[PDB]
PDB file of C-alpha atoms in Angstrom:
ATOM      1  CA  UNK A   1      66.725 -14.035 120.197  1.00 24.75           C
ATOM      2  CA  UNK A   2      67.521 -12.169 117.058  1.00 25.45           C
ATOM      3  CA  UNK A   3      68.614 -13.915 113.677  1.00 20.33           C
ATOM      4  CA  UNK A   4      69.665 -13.551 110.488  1.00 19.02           C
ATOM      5  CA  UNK A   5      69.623 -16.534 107.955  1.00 17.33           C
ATOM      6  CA  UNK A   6      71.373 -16.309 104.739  1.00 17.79           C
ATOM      7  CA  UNK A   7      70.077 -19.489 102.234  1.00 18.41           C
ATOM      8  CA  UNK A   8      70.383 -20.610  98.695  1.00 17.15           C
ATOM      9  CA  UNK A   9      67.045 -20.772  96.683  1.00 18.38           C
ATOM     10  CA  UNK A  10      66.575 -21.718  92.893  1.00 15.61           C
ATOM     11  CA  UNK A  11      67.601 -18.804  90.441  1.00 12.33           C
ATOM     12  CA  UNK A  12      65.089 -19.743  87.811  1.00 12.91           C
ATOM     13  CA  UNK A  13      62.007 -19.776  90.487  1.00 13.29           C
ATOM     14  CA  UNK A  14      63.285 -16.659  92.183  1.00 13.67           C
ATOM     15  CA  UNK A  15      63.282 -15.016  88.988  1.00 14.72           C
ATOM     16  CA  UNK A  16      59.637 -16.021  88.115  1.00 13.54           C
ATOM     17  CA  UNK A  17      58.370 -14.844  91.533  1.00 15.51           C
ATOM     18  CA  UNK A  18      59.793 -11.622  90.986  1.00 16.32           C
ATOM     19  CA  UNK A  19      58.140 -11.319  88.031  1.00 14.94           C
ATOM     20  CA  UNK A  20      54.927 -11.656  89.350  1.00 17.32           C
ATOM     21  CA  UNK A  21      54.854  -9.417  91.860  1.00 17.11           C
ATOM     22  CA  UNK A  22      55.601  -6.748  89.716  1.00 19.73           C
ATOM     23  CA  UNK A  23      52.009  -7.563  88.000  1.00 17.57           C
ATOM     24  CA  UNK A  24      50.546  -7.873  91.113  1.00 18.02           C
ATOM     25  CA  UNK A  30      49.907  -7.070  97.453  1.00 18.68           C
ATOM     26  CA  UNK A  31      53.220  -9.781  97.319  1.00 18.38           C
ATOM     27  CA  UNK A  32      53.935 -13.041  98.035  1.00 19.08           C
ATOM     28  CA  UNK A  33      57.427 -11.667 100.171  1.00 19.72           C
ATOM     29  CA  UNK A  34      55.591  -8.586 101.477  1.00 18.94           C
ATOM     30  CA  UNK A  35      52.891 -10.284 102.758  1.00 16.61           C
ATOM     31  CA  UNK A  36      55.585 -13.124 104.361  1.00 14.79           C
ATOM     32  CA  UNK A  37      57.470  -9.854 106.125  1.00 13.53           C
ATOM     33  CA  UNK A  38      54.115  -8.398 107.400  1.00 11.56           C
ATOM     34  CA  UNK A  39      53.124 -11.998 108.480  1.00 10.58           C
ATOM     35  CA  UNK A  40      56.401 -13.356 110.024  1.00  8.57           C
ATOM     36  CA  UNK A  41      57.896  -9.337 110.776  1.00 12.19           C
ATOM     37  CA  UNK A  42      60.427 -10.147 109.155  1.00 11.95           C
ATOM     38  CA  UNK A  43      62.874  -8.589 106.748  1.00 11.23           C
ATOM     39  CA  UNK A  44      64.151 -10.048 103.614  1.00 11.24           C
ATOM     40  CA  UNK A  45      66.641  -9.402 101.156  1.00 11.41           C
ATOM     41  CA  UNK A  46      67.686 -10.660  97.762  1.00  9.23           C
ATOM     42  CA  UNK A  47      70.993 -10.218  95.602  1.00 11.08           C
ATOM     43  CA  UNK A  59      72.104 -20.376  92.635  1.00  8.87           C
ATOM     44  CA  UNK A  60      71.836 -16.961  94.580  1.00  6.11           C
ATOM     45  CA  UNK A  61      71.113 -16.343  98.151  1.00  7.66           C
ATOM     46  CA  UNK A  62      68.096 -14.338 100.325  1.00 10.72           C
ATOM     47  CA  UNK A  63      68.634 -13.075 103.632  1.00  9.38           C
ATOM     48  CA  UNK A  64      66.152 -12.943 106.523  1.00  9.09           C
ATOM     49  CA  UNK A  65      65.825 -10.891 109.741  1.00 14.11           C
ATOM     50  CA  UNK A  66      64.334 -11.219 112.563  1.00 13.57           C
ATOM     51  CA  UNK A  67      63.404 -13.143 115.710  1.00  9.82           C
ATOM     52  CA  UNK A  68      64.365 -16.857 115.463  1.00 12.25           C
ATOM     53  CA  UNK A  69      60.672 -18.110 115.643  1.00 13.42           C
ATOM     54  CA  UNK A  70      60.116 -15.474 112.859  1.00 12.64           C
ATOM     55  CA  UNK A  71      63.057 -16.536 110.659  1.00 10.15           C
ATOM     56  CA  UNK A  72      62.148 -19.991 110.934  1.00  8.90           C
ATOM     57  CA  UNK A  73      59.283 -19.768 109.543  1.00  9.17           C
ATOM     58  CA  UNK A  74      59.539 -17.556 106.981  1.00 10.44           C
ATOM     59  CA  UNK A  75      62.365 -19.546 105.611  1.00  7.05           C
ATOM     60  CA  UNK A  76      60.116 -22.402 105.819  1.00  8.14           C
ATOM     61  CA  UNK A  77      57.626 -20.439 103.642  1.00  5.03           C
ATOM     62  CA  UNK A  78      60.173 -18.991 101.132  1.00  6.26           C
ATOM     63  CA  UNK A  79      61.938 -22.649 100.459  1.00  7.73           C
ATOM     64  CA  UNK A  80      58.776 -24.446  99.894  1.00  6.10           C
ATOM     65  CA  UNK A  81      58.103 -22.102  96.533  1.00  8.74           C
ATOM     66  CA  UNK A  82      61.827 -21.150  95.620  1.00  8.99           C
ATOM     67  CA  UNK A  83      62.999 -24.978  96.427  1.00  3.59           C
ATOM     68  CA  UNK A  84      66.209 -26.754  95.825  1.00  2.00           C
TER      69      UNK A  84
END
């Protein structure tokens, strides 16, 4: 089974995250190499690919630090 999810996540924390990776490997790089996943990004919306086991849980990862 193949997915892709498309979900809302908090502009301001999103924006933070970002920010941090860029002085840091990353938090969403090491998600995609953990979950082989793919995820994309522009409250605004991400976008994640991959098998539905896969997408579950990185969406469950994601949410939990860019919450609503």
């Amino acid at each position: 089974s193949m997915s892709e999810e498309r979900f809302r996540v908090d502009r301001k924390k999103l924006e933070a995250m970002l920010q941090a990776a860029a002085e840091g490997e990353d938090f969403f790089q090491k998600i995609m190499e953990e979950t082989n996943t793919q995820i994309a990004w522009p409250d605004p919306h991400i976008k994640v690919s991959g098998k539905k086991e896969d997408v579950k849980e990185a969406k469950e990862m994601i949410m939990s630090v860019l919450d609503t």
